[PDB]
Design a protein around this ligand. Structure first.
Ligand SMILES: NC(=O)c1ccc[n+]([C@@H]2O[C@H](COP(=O)([O-])OP(=O)(O)OC[C@H]3O[C@@H](n4cnc5c(N)ncnc54)[C@H](OP(=O)(O)O)[C@@H]3O)[C@@H](O)[C@H]2O)c1
Ligand SMILES: NC(=O)c1ccc[n+]([C@@H]2O[C@H](COP(=O)([O-])OP(=O)(O)OC[C@H]3O[C@@H](n4cnc5c(N)ncnc54)[C@H](OP(=O)(O)O)[C@@H]3O)[C@@H](O)[C@H]2O)c1
Ligand SMILES: NC(=O)c1ccc[n+]([C@@H]2O[C@H](COP(=O)([O-])OP(=O)(O)OC[C@H]3O[C@@H](n4cnc5c(N)ncnc54)[C@H](OP(=O)(O)O)[C@@H]3O)[C@@H](O)[C@H]2O)c1
Ligand SMILES: NC(=O)c1ccc[n+]([C@@H]2O[C@H](COP(=O)([O-])OP(=O)(O)OC[C@H]3O[C@@H](n4cnc5c(N)ncnc54)[C@H](OP(=O)(O)O)[C@@H]3O)[C@@H](O)[C@H]2O)c1
Ligand SMILES: O=C1Nc2ccccc2C1=O
Ligand SMILES: O=C1Nc2ccccc2C1=O
Ligand SMILES: O=C1Nc2ccccc2C1=O
Ligand SMILES: O=C1Nc2ccccc2C1=O
Lengths: 260, 260, 260, 260
């Protein structure tokens, strides 16, 4: 698990929606590598539990602020809080996304459609616009989007959600092309089924949904992912180990095929 | 030009935003192949001129209705008008899209962002939901989305527009997967620079912008596209000549490379 | 059904390996649209039977020559035979491909590896080099490669074959970029499971084994392909309906997902 | 800079063609992270100079063997030499590739065509077959292919080389799917223009010819690559930081666009 990598000493990262699951694993890895990290999520109780969990592991250069990531008020509070705590921003990890609908795409109301894009796409664009001048001031940095393997392979039941993740592939690229002038690299991850609360539904009940879903999605490595399976990639994408990489998506899905 | 193809006798198609350019060329080709076609656009004057142009060529199985494609009132009027005129719907070509912004993606306001998705993505989803039961009643049919090569290669100046076209690649796929049960095939085109009013800006002033832009985009075939360059593909995708093809995008850009 | 399309009057096409299955369906469609066609395959008896099958349908502008498509002697003879019979070449359809191996990729001998590339890739490159000056002399034309959906989704059992089909995606593109100067458009089809002798092992077992295979393969349209499912696309790709399209692959797999 | 990463203590890697350029940078990075590495190339003098360069930096867990990577005799000797020196193999980096041709694809002789595939593809397949039982014996490991961004964007002048790199995208995938059972992850890098002897023709001309090339190549980050730009990615792909990732290609081209 430990890499002795210390690629983030003197860096400040915001990780949105990072009190559980993938976002929390990302924050932990950045802290392990020397970063200062601000995490956010809606519920102060989750912020508190996450901060405690991290500080119990000796990861103390972390602060947390509760807010709704699609609230323009709360977006500004998150960015300003980061500047107040640590004085600068180098890295933004847009990890937020909602998956509330489950059903046929024809049954997605216009309201739910707009809400999916508001939280899953627009809020990441808004957060990028807010952090941009601060990252640019440091001479550059990194922005990472957490999309989904469903961006490439449209899934049943949550297809509208999948479309918003396709959108993030394009948004990642567009911001990469537009922010290169500021030496800000924009990349993304596209995780497969990761065992978190959002995907609990699918794989509920041990091996039965954890063994058929395994080879129903066609996962070559024969297991579902865990949150930490995303952290090494985000750390790599935010570090100088990827200094010549921008605009790219890395699929983290155990070998499931959906593009060349 | 004439193909003697008559693949659409007894079929009814809606082509949105089809009084000029690509949409009008699509409607003309479907009419040439025996279809009944309803065209729409915002301005009644454009509807009138398009209907006249078509009827002067002997293409008389066409009707037109003016409306804003992002108005839910006007969407219902367009679909109901088609059912009133021709009794059924077999084919929907979502050709509408706006490109009002020009500038850096960081300067796209949240309002313009939402408007781009409302017209370029949501309205096509809304039109699909409206026509779906009618196409399904005929035993199946075709829905075609006009995306853009900029869905794959993020362009300068109109990057936000490009992201909405990336979205349509995903929406095309999602609807293909969800509407297969009704034998409704959903595919798209992704045209490069086509010489229309929307792209007049770029290639203005004869060969100078029509010869440098030619090999500034890197077009292997050494010329810009024209609206009719899209019609053969849409006709193919809506016909039984593509009866085993769904969920796919065809790039119509004269050999510009942006995916494998 | 007929399309009544007649897009190929006065045109000459070579279709390789076209005495059965997909190649024969392609040849038949071009002949139906007015073309003169030369077909070939190894076995003179298959040539005879194909020619008689076609001529019995009134498709008499056809001629056949037996040869091995990877033999440089036979390649020259096929091209010269076409020029002698019909005076020119406008269109080459590289339909040929073999898959003798079935098993794990690690058990593919170096010899079988090289043979797969010799027939499935090199022979299409060689045929392209031979026809090129003749197509260029007519002011341009079309070359179509029959790859496979396994070019994008690596299959079990025939993975090495799949790699040769990935190669053809690249070769189609490389030739498109290099022959644009001559107005020769190079595109490809990437069929899914098409019911022919080559794929019989997968789908033989009655219409229930097929229905099972469509669910395993995740074919949205719920059926296997047939050879004619490819013919309309090749005709479209070889016609002026695709005159602004080069370097592209069209997946013909009933909605199986393997790229955006 | 250092990363201080130490992810490879007790691991053994083979890096092919690794006495200059990208391969040497990869070997150096693995050694810096604690690995034992075997490097090879044709010329004993280059092996000597690479070994001395490394040992002068204190990287002494390295050994070298001269051989031709497409020689089955030399392939066996390279693998057996690694086992004799270090007892095991965990990691194979297939870095080798040649491009002797420059010109139009139509002028590539059949012989040069076959030689391109022999070195650039077949030798990596052969090396994979040789190392596989040894990596599998360790409970799994990693194989990395160095393809090229020209696998996705067909280049002028070296199109045939580009096709061999498209092949490697497919081969990486096929091997990923087939070696998953052994917990062997197979991934690839697809570098853009990296400043090495191989690419010198393109970028030699001073830091103004380079700046010009970055604009022609449309490199968002505005500079050419260097060998170390590849090393962090290979190390990441070979480490447990990518333990849920197999079958993927990472483009390392400073933001040049050629797939979604
Ligand atoms: N797990 C998977 O299968 C999977 C696969 C592909 C992609 N992803 C992506 O990974 C990301 C994280 O998913 P996860 O599975 O790790 O979820 P998770 O374990 O349920 O974590 C959710 C986190 O998001 C926070 N959150 C939820 N809504 C929020 C809002 N409106 N504003 C701010 N924070 C919010 C939650 O805290 P509060 O409740 O306190 O707000 C919590 O910290 C998502 O973008 C998802 O699309 C997940
Ligand atoms: N030309 C290109 O370079 C290019 C490249 C890639 C993709 N595309 C796509 O092709 C499609 C058509 O573009 P085009 O270049 O052919 O445009 P165009 O020639 O300017 O045609 C525009 C058509 O859309 C109608 N329209 C505009 N806004 C509308 C609205 N809100 N509701 C209903 N109709 C509306 C116009 O009529 P009214 O003014 O009367 O409404 C007209 O009929 C678009 O989706 C575009 O994104 C174009
Ligand atoms: N069926 C599928 O599921 C499927 C899917 C994707 C792609 N494809 C591709 O479709 C193409 C055609 O295959 P098919 O499925 O139509 O097979 P098929 O029905 O078995 O027909 C194969 C044809 O190729 C000829 N042939 C075989 N070896 C030859 C050689 N060395 N030289 C010249 N002709 C030769 C055969 O005739 P002779 O025996 O007389 O030579 C026969 O006419 C292939 O490239 C294949 O890879 C097939
Ligand atoms: N540079 C670029 O722009 C670029 C871009 C994309 C991909 N790549 C890929 O990067 C890889 C490495 O190339 P590079 O740019 O680092 O080239 P480089 O700096 O010229 O190094 C090439 C290395 O390969 C060795 N080599 C050449 N032929 C060999 C053979 N038959 N057997 C064993 N070793 C051999 C050479 O040593 P000896 O002379 O002693 O054999 C040398 O150590 C290649 O696969 C290339 O296709 C390069
Ligand atoms: O996009 C997704 N595809 C998935 C498949 C399984 C579990 C979760 C998800 C996603 O969030
Ligand atoms: O998406 C687009 N990319 C373009 C390039 C040139 C002209 C028009 C367009 C588009 O509409
Ligand atoms: O698509 C394919 N289906 C197949 C069945 C058997 C052998 C090869 C193939 C293909 O390439
Ligand atoms: O990316 C590349 N840049 C190059 C320059 C010269 C030769 C080959 C290549 C590549 O594959």
């Amino acid at each position: 698990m430990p890499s002795n990598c210390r690629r983030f000493e003197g860096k400040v990262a915001i990780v949105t929606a990072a009190t559980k699951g993938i976002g929390l694993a990302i924050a932990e890895r950045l802290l392990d590598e020397g970063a200062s990290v601000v995490i956010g999520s809606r519920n102060q109780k989750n912020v508190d539990e996450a901060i405690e969990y991290l500080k119990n592991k000796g990861l103390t250069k972390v602060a947390g602020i509760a807010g709704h990531i699609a609230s323009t008020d709360d977006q500004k509070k998150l960015v300003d809080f980061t500047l107040q705590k640590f004085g600068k921003i180098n890295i933004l990890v847009n990890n937020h996304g909602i998956n509330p609908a489950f059903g046929h795409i024809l049954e997605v109301s216009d309201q739910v459609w707009d809400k999916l894009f508001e939280v899953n796409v627009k809020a990441g664009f808004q957060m990028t616009k807010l952090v941009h001048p601060h990252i640019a001031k440091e001479g550059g940095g990194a922005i990472i989007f957490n999309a989904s393997y469903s961006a490439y392979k449209s899934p049943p039941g949550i297809a509208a959600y999948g479309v918003t993740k396709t959108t993030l592939v394009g948004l990642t690229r567009a911001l990469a092309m537009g922010l290169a002038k500021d030496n800000i690299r924009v990349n993304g991850i596209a995780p497969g089924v990761i065992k978190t609360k959002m995907s609990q539904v699918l794989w509920d009940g041990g091996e039965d949904a954890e063994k058929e879903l395994t080879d129903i999605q066609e996962i070559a490595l024969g297991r579902l992912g865990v949150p930490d399976d995303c952290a090494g990639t985000v750390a790599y994408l935010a570090s100088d180990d990827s200094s010549y990489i921008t605009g790219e998506m890395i699929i983290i899905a155990g070998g499931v095929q959906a593009r060349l």
